[PDB]
Structure formats: C-alpha cells, structure tokens
Design a protein around this ligand. Structure first.
Ligand SMILES: Nc1ncnc2c1ncn2[C@@H]1O[C@H](COP(=O)(O)OP(=O)(O)OP(=O)(O)O)[C@@H](O)[C@H]1O
Ligand SMILES: Nc1ncnc2c1ncn2[C@@H]1O[C@H](COP(=O)(O)OP(=O)(O)OP(=O)(O)O)[C@@H](O)[C@H]1O
Ligand SMILES: O=c1[nH]cnc2c1ncn2[C@@H]1O[C@H](COP(=O)(O)O)[C@@H](O)[C@H]1O
Ligand SMILES: O=c1[nH]cnc2c1ncn2[C@@H]1O[C@H](COP(=O)(O)O)[C@@H](O)[C@H]1O
Ligand SMILES: O=c1[nH]cnc2c1ncn2[C@@H]1O[C@H](COP(=O)(O)O)[C@@H](O)[C@H]1O
Ligand SMILES: O=c1[nH]cnc2c1ncn2[C@@H]1O[C@H](COP(=O)(O)O)[C@@H](O)[C@H]1O
Ligand SMILES: [Mg+2]
Ligand SMILES: [Mg+2]
Ligand SMILES: [Mg+2]
Ligand SMILES: [Mg+2]
Lengths: 470, 470, 470, 470
C-alpha cells in the first residue's frame, strides 16, 4: 500500500458535503489540513495551484519506475555500461529531501543545521565513527551549493536511487578502482561530480527530449491519480475567489493532463454538465520557470492554444477570457487578478520552488502538498510506541541507554524505508521538516482536504514564545 | 535603570561559589542561561569569546550618546546643517534590530517573514492603512539587501536614532521640499539612500579615524562595565578546556580594554596574584573581519605586541606562547586548538556576524549575549498582566475586541520604548527573536551567567514536533 | 564567379613543385601569403588546422542558401509568418563582419573605433544626417556586447541577410506598426533584440538539431571545395613538424568531411597509396569549444571512434596513436606535442575565436584564411582606378570635391556588393581589416598558398615607426 | 638635462605669434604636434584638459624623489625594515609603462602582444635563456590583470624604482631566504604580490592621507613647471570654442596648483590684466574618477568653493557661471557643453584613463602629452646612427650578425636608461608605443605645442593599407 494507493482510495470516494459528515471526516489525520501559522480563509481572495505532484499526483512506484527506466536507458545510450540495464527501481530505498555530496559520492540525510543523520555510500550505510573521516564535524556547509545537491521533489526519487545504484555498481565492479572522489577505469577518471552531472542531465533529457511525457499520456490510468472531487473543490473556490494555475510544464502536456483530471461524465458534481478544465481558472500560466518566476521572471508570452506554440512577441494586453499565458512573473498574477500576496493561497509540492520562494520573495500564503504523508501518518500511528519509547529514553538519559536509543531510532526509521522518515531520524528533525514548518503555512497529504473545511474557517496555530518568555 | 545599570549592579557582587548558593542564584531569570537547543557542557573543549558588547559591555546611555555626538559632529564637519548640533541622543526611541528602508526613509520593525510590525518616518508612526501606500502587502523583501539595512548591534543604536532625527529634521525644515525618496534643496537632491550612506560612513569614520576609542579609553569607568567575576569564570573554563579571543577590534584597543576588564588588585579570586589578561587565553586573534572570518577569512598575520603593528608577511608558524594573531579564518582556531566546530562554544553579541555565521558556516555551538535582556526581563515580569490579557483576547477572538488587541499591544510595546520590545510587538515575534531562537543554542543577559552552572551541566530544550506529529 | 568558384578553379589544378614554377605561381596575389608581422617558417614546429571554412571551404552561394533556407523554415515552424517562405538568399547583400544593433535593428559596418561607415535598416541605407538621430556621434560603443553583435564568420552570412529581410518584412507589412525598438502586432510587441535572439537560436538549432549537416553530407560535391593538393601540403608539413586538427565540430561530422577532403584515388601525390585522413595528424581534437579552448577550456575527453560517442570520464593518459580527443584546452596541445606557443602556426578562419584569442591568450603564431579574398583581389585590381581617384581626391582635399569623394566611395563599394568590401568603405578601413592586421601574422585566400613557399621561408613585414621616429 | 629641464627651458620663452615665427618653430620636433590619425581642428568645438602631468607638469627628478621618499617612509612606519631609509631615488632606472609581475617579482618591458623585451629581477637583468624558466614562451597573458600591473603614469616612476629596490634588498639580505614567489623570514612569508600591494597602498596613502600635496604646495617653484604661454593658448581656444577641466584631483589641491600655473603679473599676454584661473574654463570638474568617468561615472556633485567641501545632495541644476562640479560622467560634459564626442579634443597624460577610455567608450578626439618626449627626441636624433645600423643589420639578416643586433640594441637602449626607451627596445615597439599609435589621435611633448598651429589646421596622417592592398 503505497502513499498513492492511499490517495487513490480516498480519490474514489464521492464527497458527502453534509456539514456534520465534513466535520467528522477532517477529524482523521489523512483528511486533515495541518497548520504551522494561523490563516483566516475568509481573507484569501485567490487560490493558486501548481500542476505536477499537486493537481496531478503520479502513481507510485509505477511513475518513479518509468522515470528510472528511461534515465537508465539514456545513460546507456550515451556510453554507460550495459550492466545499468540490470538495475530495477526500488521504492524502499529513497526518501525525499536527501543531499547528494558530489565530492565523496554519499547520499546524506541532514537536519536544518547541516548535521548528518544518515550517510550512505552506494548501499553501504556508514556509522558515525567512519563518517568522521570525510565529515570531521559530522556536518555539511549547506551554502556549498556546488558540492551539495538537495533532492527536493518526488521527480527526484528515481535519481536518488540511481545515484546509489551507480556508486554501488562502480565500487563493486573489478573493472574500476575506487578513489576518494570517484572511479578510475584505466586512463579514464570519472568523479562522483561528473557522474552526478550525467544523471542530472539524463533526467532533464528524459523530461524535455525523451519519452517520459509520451509514455505517461498513453496510459494515464496507470500513471496519474484521478479524483471526482477535484472539480467540486475548484468550483467552490471560484464561488468565493479567483483560481489560477501556474506550472513549470508546457501547454500541450498541461492540456493532456488537465483534460484527464477532469474527464468524468459530469462537471463539479454528478448530474451536472461536464465543463472544460480551462473554465475552472481565472488565469492559466504555463512555462512558469519557478523559482525565477518569483524574482525577475521571464518575458510574458501568449500561448496560441490551437497550435500549442507561443505567439511571437511579448504580450502587452489585458486578462481576456480564454487567454493562456507563458512565462511572466508572480507580479503578472498579482496585477492581472488584482491581488496582494497575502490575498493569495498558493498550493504546491516543491518546498523550494513553490513554497519557500513565494513566501520569502512575495509574502504569499502557502499550502504544501506532501503526497507521502498519506502513508507516513499510517506508520506514525501504527508505530507510535517506538517513538514514545525513544522519547522516554531521551528523558531517562537525564551508557547502555544510549545504545538503546540508537537501536530504537534505527528500528523506527526502518519502518519508513532504508533512508527513514521524510521528517525525522528518531528524535532529530530533518531539513525538509524544518522547511515545512518555516515556510508552509498549511500542509496536507492532498490539497483536496480543503474540501472538508468551510469557506471562512480559521486555521489556528499556537503563538510561539521564546525560552525566557515561558 | 538602564540594562547596563542592572548589569553593573550584578557585576559589583562577589561570587558565592557555594553549590547551593549557585543553584539558587541561577533560579532568577536575570542570572539564568536560556536554552534553544540542548547542549552538554562536558562536550565543549574550547570556549571562544568576542570582546565588544560581550566581554566589554559599554554603559548605556552614556556610550551610545558619545557615539551619537561624534557621528553628528562628523556629519556637520562634512557639510550637514548646523541644526544637527541641537540633536541629543534619546535612549527611549531606538530598539535594536530595526530595518532602515533606504528607498522611503522609514525605520521598520519586521517579523521573520518581512511582515511590518512598526513603521516610523522620522518620529511619525505610520498606522496600517497609511503604510499600504508604500508597502502594499505590508511586507518587505528581505533579500533586497541594497534597499533594506538591518541594524543588528548595540553599536547601531546611535545611527538608528540619528536616521530618525534626520528624516524628522529635513521633513519639518522649510528649506527642504519632501519627496517620496528624499529631499529637494534647490538644485540639490538628497535621497534617503545617500543620507543613509552618509550616516553609515560617518559611524565608520568615528570608529576608525575619529575620537570614539580615545574618548572611551580616557574614561573607562564611565563607559565600560567591569566585573571581578570575569577572571574567575575564565580561569574555571581554562581548567576544563581551551579559551580563545576573536575580535574585530585592533590589538592596541583590545589591550587597553582587556587590561581595564582585568584591573583588580587580584587574579581570579580575591587574595590571588593578579595575572595579565593575555594569560587567560590559549589563542588571541584580533582584526578578525567577522563574518568573512567564518568563510575565506583573510591572510593570517602576527601582531608585534611591543609596537602594536603587524609583522610583515603571512605567519606560517605554530601556536606559541605569547603570540597574538591578526586576520586568519575560523579554520585557524580549529587547527591551532585542535577543535572541531561542535567542541567550540563561541560567545558573542552580533546575531549575524558572530552567531548565525559561525553556526551555519562551521557548525559551532553558540551563546548569544543580549545585554538588554537584563531590563527586558524586568518589564516582561512587571507587565506580564498586559501580555496575559493579549493572549486571552487572541483566544476569545475565536469587532471591538480587535481594537482592544491593538490598544493592549500598543500599551505593552510602549513599556519598552517607542519602538517596542526587541523580541516582539504584542503577540508577533520580531526577526531578531526568530534569529535568536534559530541560531543561538544558548542565550543570556551576560556570558557571566555560565559561572552559576557546573562544568558538566546539560542544558536541555524540549524536542520539537510537527503539527501532524502532535 | 563567386570566391568559391575561384577557389575550386585553383583546387582543380595539380601542383607543379618545380621550384621555379612555385616561385612564379606565388607571384600572383591569389596564390600569395600576405604578411602582417615577420615569421620565420623554420621556427614553426607544429602546424594546427581548423576544419570548417579552413580545410573544408563550403561552396557559395549554395551553402549559405541552404543555411538560409533551413533557418527560415525553423522560424516558420516556431510561429513566424508564412511570408518568410517567400525570402530567397541573396549573396549580393551581406558582407562579413557587420554589426547588428539589437536596440534599433540596423546592420552597421564600422571601423576599429566604432565609427559608422554604413548603416542599413532592412534594405534602406541610411545616409549620414538621418543616422545622427540614432547615433548622435556617428559612433557605437563596442564594449556594449549585449547591444551589438559582430557577425564574424562565413556561417553568419545567412543570418546577416535574414536579419535585413525580417526588418524589411515587418516594416512594410501593414499588420505591424513600426516603433523605434521593434514592431507592434496588436497586443504583441516584438523587439529587434528578441527577433535577433530568435534568429540566432534558429541558426544554432539548424546546426545542432536540424538538417544542415545531413543535407551537406548527402551532397558533398555541391557544398564542399575539394583539392588534391591538401594531402600534399599536409604531408610536407609532417616532414618538418607536427600537424594537429582542432575543430569546434563533433567527431562524426569531422570524419565525414575529412574523409571527403581526402577522397582521391591516391595519397599525397598521384601514384601514391591512399591513406586515411587521420594519418596526416599527430593530434586530432574535436568539440574544441573555441574560444573558451584558449582559456580554461573544458575537461579532456576521449572519443570512442567506433561509436562516435565520448568515453565516460576525463582522459588522463598519454598521446597514443589513433587516439581522438574532445574538449580540453590549448594547453593540451602544447603539452602533448611539446610545443610552446611561438612554435605553433595555427591556421583558421574565425578572426575572434581562432586568431585573436590564440594570439592574445597564448602567443600562438597565426594564419588567417579569408575565403572572399579570392574575389576581393580580382575587384581590387580590376577597379584600382576608382581607389586611385579616391586617393588623389583625398590629397587634393588639402566643396564639390567632398561630394565627389562620397560618390566615388559609393561606386567603389558597390563593386563588392550592397555592404561593400570586407576590408574598407572607400578610404576608411573596417574593424575586420584592423583585426586582421593586428592579430593575423599571415593571411591568404587559402591555407594551400603555403605550398608555394619553401620550408625555411622568411615572411617579412616592414618594421613599424611612430610619427616622431620618421 | 631631464625632460622637465627641456620643458621649463621652452616654458621660459615668450610667444612670438608672428605667423612666420610660428611656422618655423613647429618645424622643430620638440615643438611639433605628431599625428596618428587626421584631425581637422576647425571641427573641434570643446577643448578638455586634465591637470596633473598635463597642465601641471611636475619637475624631474625632484618630484619623483619626493614621492619615493614619502612612500619609503610610509613603508618603514608600517613595519618595513630600517634599511629602506638607505634607498635613494635613481631616475636612470625606471622607464614608464613597465609591467610588474606579482607572481615572480620581475619588472617587464613588453610589446603589444605580451612578448618580453626586458626582464629585471631587482637590478639583475635576466637574459633570454634564463627568462624561459619563468616565461617559457617569452610571453605574458595581459588579460591576467590580477598578476600583471602596468605602471602607466609618471606618478608610477617612484614605485617602479621602489619595487626593484625592494626585490634587490630582500634578495641580498641574509635575514631572508628567497623563494620563487617571495621571501621567507623565519615563520613569516612575504610574497611579491603582498609586497607589491604594500607599495601600491603606501603610494595611495602618500597621495590621499600623507604629506605629498602639502610639501608640493609649499615649494611650487621646485616641483612644478610654470609657463606664461598657458593662459595665451587657453585664451585663444576660448575664442573658437569651449574649454573644460576634468581632473581626478580634489578642488582644494586643484585651486592651489591652477593658481600657481596662472600666477604672472598679467593675463593671457604681457600688459593684460591678470584674470583668475577659473575664468579660462567654461566647465570645471574635479574628483572625476577617470576612467570610471567614461562609463557610469559617479553622482554629480557641486563643490562649495568657499569651504572646498561638497554640498550635500546630487546636483540637478544647469551650468552656471562660477559653478564647480565634482564626480559625474563624461556625459555631464557633453550635455552641459552641448558637444558630441568628435567635437571634443581631450588633452591628457594617462594613456589608459584619459586617452584609451575616452576614445573607446565615447569617441572623443584625443591628444596625449608625453613629457619624456622632450628628452627622448634629443636622444633619438643624437643617436640616430645606432638605430640606422640596427635597421641595416636587420635588412642584412635577410650568425655573428645576430649577436651584433643584440649588442647594438643594448647600446641604443642604454642611452635612454637602464629600462630603455619608453617607445621601443631596439627594433621592437613597446606596448606603450602601440597604445599611443592606436588611441592618441595627436601627441606631443607638451599640449603647449598647439599654440604653434593655426585655428583651422588640418593635422594629417597617411591612409593605412593592408599588405594585399599595397
Ligand atoms: N530545499 C532547497 N533546495 C535547493 N536550494 C535550497 C533549499 N533550501 C535552501 N536552499 C538554498 O541553498 C543555499 C544555501 O542555503 P543556506 O543553508 O546558506 O541558506 P538557508 O536556506 O537560508 O538556511 P536556513 O535554512 O538556516 O535559513 C541558499 O541559496 C538557499 O536559498
Ligand atoms: N595601459 C593599461 N593599463 C591598465 N589596463 C589596461 C591597459 N591597457 C589595457 N588594459 C586592460 O587590461 C585588460 C587586459 O588587456 P588585454 O590585452 O586582454 O586587452 P587589450 O588592451 O584590448 O589588448 P590589445 O592591446 O591587443 O587591444 C583589459 O581590461 C584592458 O582594458
Ligand atoms: O528534474 C527535472 N528535470 C527536468 N524537468 C523537470 C524536472 N523535475 C520536474 N520537471 C518538469 O517540471 C514540470 C512540473 O512542473 P509543475 O507543474 O510546476 O510542478 C513537468 O513538466 C516536469 O517534466
Ligand atoms: O558600524 C561600525 N563601523 C565601524 N566599526 C564598527 C562598527 N560597529 C562595530 N565596529 C567595530 O568593531 C569592533 C568590535 O568588534 P568585536 O570585539 O568583534 O565585537 C570595535 O573595534 C568597533 O569599533
Ligand atoms: O552560429 C553557429 N551556431 C551553431 N554552430 C555553429 C555556428 N557557427 C559555426 N557552428 C559550428 O561550428 C563548427 C565549425 O567549427 P570549426 O571547425 O572549428 O570551424 C561546425 O560544426 C558548425 O556547425
Ligand atoms: O597612484 C596613485 N594613487 C593615488 N592617487 C594618485 C595616484 N596617481 C595619481 N593620483 C592622484 O590623481 C590626481 C591626478 O589627477 P589628474 O589631474 O586627472 O591627472 C592627483 O590628485 C594625484 O594625487
Ligand atoms: Mg509541482
Ligand atoms: Mg562584539
Ligand atoms: Mg572554422
Ligand atoms: Mg593627469
């Protein structure tokens, strides 16, 4: 039961909009909206959506596997060894938000301070003493962005696993000699950094020039979660405000995906006429180039929606019915919809490119969709006893207790996968957790959980106090 | 009773090192060390100190007044109007950590998200609706560092007030015409940005080329807090670890100040021989150029301590008794003392240049000295009823209640000064508060509060949980 | 009779290597090597060649037409109007080395000082007084590289003409309104700068992703000059030194072109066994990325010559027989061939990327191939009377004489084409001429002209004197 | 007889403005204006002057000695050894336009291509074979501006000599160990680069914060050439055009110097009333910050001429009688005087900051003052036989002749000083010569030589032809 199985199971249910039914549903953690900072929904005038992994949640592990396969086949086609074709995606290895160290070829799970929580070289998990050889303070400098790459999105799960597969392969293959910073193959030296760049290039190629989109669109039921409740929620938002779409994707792909997401024999509710996806939006913007979008952006263009090509020239005209925009900046949306940032709730999945940048650069209100939460909640509850033990041990710690804390931390972590919870390693929160708490005003397993709250709901978080104020 | 009066009152007391006396003393908030993240003192192998506003706490308002006076006289000497000589420092206006907006000439108190809490143009406090003309989302982009300058240190209190005095002066003087971005004086236009730069240049000049240091050193009892307990604490730290000094100041000034701080007819305790200040340190480093120090640094130099001049050439030798270093990098300290970052507790007052940068760049443990805490605690306790009311109102808020929340927030804020608490405006925490909580492992009114805790004390903070984990 | 007709006519002749025949041949300007700075051929130890427009001279106007056609079809395919398909390359318009002004959409012919010699907006040649509206000092700032683009190579002849065709089209088409910096089409604005970028992108696409190379290789006799004397010259150079190839092209294309250039039923001379092209070179380097090549370069790679793919990893091994390199830097060649810069004569066609950068960055000796010289010499001689008149007029000028100087300048210029000689407009030398004289030690219509000089020839230029030294 | 002796001898003569006397005077090379590119004086509408080493020519070797002495005393005061006080300026060593190599500590005389003509380490002249160890291609990369510093001005003559004195001192002093990139003194390493930076800093300090200006102004007759013909020439220029002053100097110093330059008991000619220096200028601009002046410049300020301080604010008003400007850009002059660049003849001494940048950035007409020309002409003529021999030898060279060419080159060079002619080493022209020919339209020993030519004089240079055009 993957997180996307949980999501599709919930997707297959019709909405019971009886107000008592809604209150009862949102009791369940799965259907809840979690609150980092208070947000009065009556003050939101524009609801903004991202597409991929927000509206269009790709099914797991099928979509990751497909990405993995195509990225492997691209590497082989440019000259990587044929043994790469023996690799097979394993959803139990990667956790999102890991850092690849391009100097030493390690996947790292770190906290917000750059402290090491987990270190794996290939499939070899390095324990604390051994890690001190490469990380003498058990710490990385996060500002060293040329060395350390943060794998933020669900699109990065395939490369996360592939990176580990490659280090494992070259390490254990007798044709190569391992060195601290890469592999020697005769008179050829491949650094981890250049291997990393090849992988990153190959993922990019698969998305831009390869067959990922085509294979996705030819089997949408296999690859994409579909929910009859989507048009219902959007239709309700449009009753109280404006709705916009802002995607890094191109129009032709957006049209195919959004068409699919709205393909039911009805509109917002059963019995209602079907309406085109575009009718649900006051503004549609593709090729957004987030996060640059939230700074200078790019020139505003108009899509010719018949051909799917951009019209030539910068678009200088007003918001018109049926117009589809490309490029621009966050200021385009604000100006055309007449919103200030705090009037906007932007709903996305990319912690950096959607949430952190819209919050910090523009003061937008933010909702982070965390698809894995669906399953992480089930584990958090089913295994709460292990965490409770860990909490008690940590308290009792103010020895053999310390080795028990390590053992329990490991047993807890393993319940999530080889790289542990997205949110923590035992009692230490991850960088991803700290960025969620800091930048995501709201978060949930799915944006659809907003359907279960009334229009004027006040989401509340407790006021924060400093230690000297308590 | 300024914060420095509180600090000197505590300074005049001898240490009662009876273990029961110590436990009882550190009960009081004034004498307490506050904990943002847990820290096991037994793991600290090096204690590092900054000098100014850490070891050498300048008396208030006398030292700010002196800085103010000299900065005014420098501006007048370069051509500013004679009416500046009518200005007189007012300690009731500035709060630390304000942002000067160089485009519109406002002092702003903001939260961690760039949200406006207070906006003053000269001495005119702008209420929310009027602020929307210049700040349509009631928000600033903190990454716009060319526009917004954060006044982080107690050294910035004089310019904070002076900035306000100048905008007030030019606004109300009929020789000048006010414009949105500065003042017209015939065929001369002075932008707020160029005025700001003149002030910043004049403060720098006063410190580097003017008479501030000379006037300070000629009346140290007037300007500098002195505490017999300093050598006691340092002597105790040296029993369990190494002690270093890292200052942005030059050696000649450092020597005069540190000599004064240790000038008692005894050493660590009464009855003991006096020892030179330098004997308390394993490493002394001046001209540190923090925060660059925590990145590339500068070339390591050796001070000729007889002349106070640098020896010519980069110093390539070992740590030797009596050597005094200049420049270098944080890696100099680590290498010469054989420490990794987590073995170091660095004690400073500059939230950015001491604490944030040593934490983020090097994974040092951090202790922030907040001199105003001495007095902010007295107000926090004496006026807790106003905050309690505010908390209750906010709860009751889930109208005339909303105007009561504004009124109570104001009455609370005014107890601290015209720009409110360093840490908050009513229930909204400031940027400075959020940076203290994030980057300062420990904090206190004075580093001396460490004397009241044993060598192997475990400072504990509660583990943090996400909303879905609670 | 295009310049390439002249070149192929000379190419079809067998080499008469009788020493008296050689001396007599190189009398003719067409077969001569011209000398800007003295060069002792006996000191040259390595001869380096570029491929395109050096060894492989593309036939004119056929190859330019093909590039033009494909670039047009790419623009149409991305959304440019169908009327572009009515354009047809005209070899009589463009001269090499023009500057496109992206702000005002003009093609400019300038001198070394940025002084305007010719200005055309579309096909409208702007006379001096009108040009002062846009160029008040009749001058451009050459350091404004974001505004001004120099069209240096024969590869740029198609876009030179296309730029003019486009400005002409949009200016005279009633669907568009002309503005100073581009064209309005309703709510779309297309700036000259964005049009220019579209053209540049489309040329790049044609070369990298389109069909130019494929269509070239399927009719090499149509598109490429072939000369039986090439292997003879290279074979002779290899007798006295080392020979290398350095191309910006990829290996697969290089192999197809070089195979063709050497496809005769003999080797160096008639009667000799044919040898593969690669046997003529001590070092072969593709994907050179000139001019970056002459600075940091890129990582040195090894080509797998069976597949045409790069081997994975940086190549760290020695120069080996049969190895083909990719990337690297000019230092690669020096190190592997054991040459210092002054031991190298590098033969190329790109005034900036081959000649200026190798001279300035590395102190290489330089030979510039100027394919149009073949025909420019015929005009220079056939019409010397017009220039002679101009010279006399200029002398007599120290009025109606001044209008005669303009008239004669024009009549002279028109003999070369609408944009005049590559080297001058009347008596004013072009930027391209000044760069040839400054950076090209030697130059000629073809590198083959080196066959007509002995191994130890001393090419001499007169020593230069300052005005006060004469 | 220094060049400044020659200049003052000519300065002491009254102007005979009889038209036949003028024609005859300008026959002599000393009194001639030399022409690199033709210039019609009737088209010049604005004459622009620099002050230092243009209008105010400092006497040699007295002024260089003074600069040298003060720079030495500054180095000693910051900690350099006392033996520096034994140094004494020697005018026979430095030639202008040398390059200091900060990596290896050599003074280099180079051509326009970075080819080595002379290399001295301290006072040791390194002959060709030995130089190949450090300069394997006998070449430097001029674009490596962090490594190579060009000593362009007469202000750089003292540091040129001092650099050589220092390398000599540390090399031969047994306290220091010489290394390839600097000197070891125990645990101190001083790199040539850091020594160079100390010298550059000390020269800057002497000019900005030391006593150079004060000592100059207290003995102007000792340090500054004065010429009664200056007001005559300026008065004549003002009859046919506008006259401006643009100096990097401050107003107070400019006023003292310009007052002195005009201090005669008469105005333009004997018998005429004396007029203040400022009356000779339509525009006076100080603190020009050339060459930044010819790009973005700085904010335009107004000088308060009573106090010598800048008025506060950017000056936004018109050109007014008596106004003195500070900062700004070259566009300030153009706009306020209503000139385009080709209407301006700018007269200066700094080949880079005055001449090259005004030519390339703005298309100004340029006149370079070369004070040493006064004496270099006397040597060029007196020793023409040596050059003639060299020319003949070079011809005869197309061996013992080659060693004769080296010997004659040396004997010729030594007539100018240890570092040879400014303009050449034997038959090879220097970088400075090539920049003079390229960027200086006109040049002369003194700007005063313009007095000897009529208002509408056409300065002519021969049209340049390429080798294939001859
Ligand atoms: N999740 C992420 N993915 C990619 N880049 C990131 C992410 N988070 C931060 N960055 C960027 O990485 C760079 C270095 O991060 P650094 O730790 O110095 O800053 P920070 O994110 O502000 O740290 P903190 O989380 O302590 O506020 C910055 O440019 C930052 O914007
Ligand atoms: N006389 C000088 N003094 C200081 N800087 C100079 C001088 N002449 C050129 N430069 C600068 O030095 C840098 C490197 O010079 P480089 O040889 O690459 O360019 P260049 O001067 O254009 O050469 P060329 O003389 O061949 O035209 C450039 O930024 C250039 O402007
Ligand atoms: O790593 C990547 N390389 C290239 N494209 C990516 C990558 N990750 C996501 N994308 C693309 O980004 C788009 C998702 O944009 P979204 O709708 O804004 O979430 C899709 O078109 C993806 O193909
Ligand atoms: O704004 C400033 N301008 C110039 N110097 C400053 C400023 N603020 C602090 N300083 C100097 O910084 C030094 C303080 O360094 P610390 O010991 O590292 O805290 C003192 O020498 C101050 O004079
Ligand atoms: O404008 C261009 N855009 C893209 N490729 C170009 C352009 N001009 C030349 N080239 C390519 O550069 C290569 C020529 O390299 P050369 O052998 O070094 O002259 C050929 O592969 C061309 O296709
Ligand atoms: O190397 C230097 N360092 C500092 N000032 C210099 C240097 N060289 C020249 N100057 C100053 O530049 C000014 C000369 O400007 P000019 O009138 O534009 O030639 C004088 O004030 C000099 O003091
Ligand atoms: Mg997304
Ligand atoms: Mg401090
Ligand atoms: Mg080429
Ligand atoms: Mg000067």
């Amino acid at each position: 039961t993957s997180w996307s199985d949980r999501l599709q199971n919930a997707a297959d249910m019709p909405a019971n909009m009886d107000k008592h039914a809604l209150k009862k549903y949102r009791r369940e953690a799965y259907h809840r909206v979690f609150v980092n900072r208070s947000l009065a929904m009556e003050k939101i005038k524009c609801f903004g959506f991202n597409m991929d992994y927000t509206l269009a949640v790709y099914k797991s592990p099928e979509y990751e596997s497909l990405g993995f396969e195509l990225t492997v086949e691209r590497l082989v086609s440019i000259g990587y060894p044929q043994e790469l074709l023996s690799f097979a995606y394993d959803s139990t290895f990667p956790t999102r938000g890991l850092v690849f160290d391009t100097l030493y070829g390690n996947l790292l799970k770190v906290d917000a301070y750059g402290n090491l929580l987990v270190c794996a070289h290939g499939f070899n998990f390095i324990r604390g003493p051994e890690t001190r050889e490469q990380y003498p303070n058990k710490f990385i400098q996060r500002d060293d962005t040329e060395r350390f790459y943060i794998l933020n999105t669900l699109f990065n799960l395939p490369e996360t696993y592939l990176l580990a597969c490659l280090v494992d392969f070259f390490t254990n293959c007798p044709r190569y000699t391992s060195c601290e910073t890469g592999f020697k193959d005769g008179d050829l030296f491949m650094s981890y950094r250049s291997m990393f760049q090849d992988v990153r290039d190959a993922v990019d190629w698969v998305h831009y020039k390869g067959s990922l989109k085509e294979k996705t669109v030819e089997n949408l039921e296999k690859y994409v979660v579909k929910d009859g409740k989507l048009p219902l929620l959007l239709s309700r938002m449009k009753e109280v405000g404006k709705v916009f779409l802002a995607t890094n994707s191109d129009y032709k792909y957006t049209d195919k995906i959004m068409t699919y997401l709205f393909d039911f024999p009805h509109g917002p509710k059963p019995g209602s006429s079907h309406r085109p996806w575009q009718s649900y939006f006051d503004l549609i913007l593709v090729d957004a180039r987030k996060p640059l979008f939230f700074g200078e952006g790019t020139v505003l263009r108009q899509v010719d929606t018949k051909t799917g090509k951009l019209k030539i020239g910068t678009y200088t005209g007003p918001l018109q019915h049926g117009i589809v925009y490309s490029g621009g900046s966050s200021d385009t949306i604000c100006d055309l919809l007449g919103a200030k940032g705090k009037d906007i709730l932007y709903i996305g999945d990319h912690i950096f490119g959607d949430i952190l940048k819209s919050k910090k650069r523009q003061g937008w209100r933010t909702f982070l969709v965390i698809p894995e939460l669906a399953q992480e909640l089930h584990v958090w509850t089913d295994k709460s006893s292990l965490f409770e033990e860990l909490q008690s041990l940590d308290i009792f710690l103010a020895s053999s207790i310390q080795r028990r804390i390590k053992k329990v931390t490991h047993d807890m972590d393993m319940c999530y996968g080889m790289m542990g919870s997205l949110f923590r390693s035992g009692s230490r929160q991850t960088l991803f957790a700290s960025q969620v708490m800091r930048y995501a005003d709201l978060y949930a397993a799915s944006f659809i959980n907003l359907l279960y709250y009334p229009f004027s709901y006040l989401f509340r978080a407790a006021h924060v106090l400093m230690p000297h104020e308590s």
